[PDB]
From Swiss-Prot:
It catalyses: Hydrolysis of (1->4)-beta-linkages between N-acetylmuramic acid and N-acetyl-D-glucosamine residues in a peptidoglycan and between N-acetyl-D-glucosamine residues in chitodextrins. InterPro entries: Glyco_hydro_22, Glyco_hydro_22_CS, Glyco_hydro_22_lys, Lysozyme-like_dom_sf. The active site is at 35, 53. This is Lysozyme C. It is an enzyme of class 3 (hydrolase). Keywords: Amyloid, Amyloidosis, Antimicrobial, Bacteriolytic enzyme, Disease variant, Disulfide bond, Glycosidase, Hydrolase, Secreted, Signal. One of its GO terms (molecular function) is lysozyme activity. Its main location: secreted. PANTHER family: LYSOZYME C (PTHR11407:SF28). It is found in: Secreted. It comes from Homo sapiens (Human). GO terms for biological process: antimicrobial humoral response; defense response to bacterium; defense response to Gram-negative bacterium; defense response to Gram-positive bacterium; inflammatory response; killing of cells of another organism. Residues 1-130 form the C-type lysozyme domain. Lysozymes have primarily a bacteriolytic function; those in tissues and body fluids are associated with the monocyte-macrophage system and enhance the activity of immunoagents.
Length: 130
């Protein structure tokens, strides 16, 4: 599923994401935007270390979900990577929260640093009613 902007913002808010561990809704929207363009089916294989990023948040298989084909990987979110490809993003969200419970927080995702950190991310939630 490819969410529309405001549709995603409200979905995320409903799921307890606004300000989770100090991360505002706008930041999560900025992350989802740059990671997958609000696309839950999105997947990217990383030839360099043979791992794969899954879903709307492009979560990596080496450390967060199990896809059975990533070498010496772990499954911290305790989910099949397939769960990160559903139209229903509740599992993707539970996993995204798990990722930020670690020291780096939202800095876990490089795309956030490159395109969201220290920027005016107000535009991602404006007019959405969140």
């Amino acid at each position: 599923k490819v969410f529309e902007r405001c549709e995603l913002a409200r979905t995320l808010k409903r799921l307890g994401m606004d300000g989770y561990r100090g991360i505002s809704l706008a930041n999560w929207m900025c992350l989802a935007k740059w990671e997958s363009g609000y696309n839950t089916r999105a997947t990217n294989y990383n030839a360099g270390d043979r791992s794969t990023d899954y879903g709307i948040f492009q979560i990596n298989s080496r450390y967060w979900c199990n896809d059975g084909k990533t070498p010496g990987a772990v499954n911290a979110c305790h989910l099949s990577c397939s769960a990160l490809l559903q139209d229903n993003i509740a599992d993707a969200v539970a996993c995204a929260k798990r990722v930020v419970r670690d020291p780096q927080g939202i800095r876990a995702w490089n795309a956030w640093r490159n395109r969201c950190q220290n920027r005016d991310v107000r535009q991602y939630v404006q007019g959405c009613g969140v």
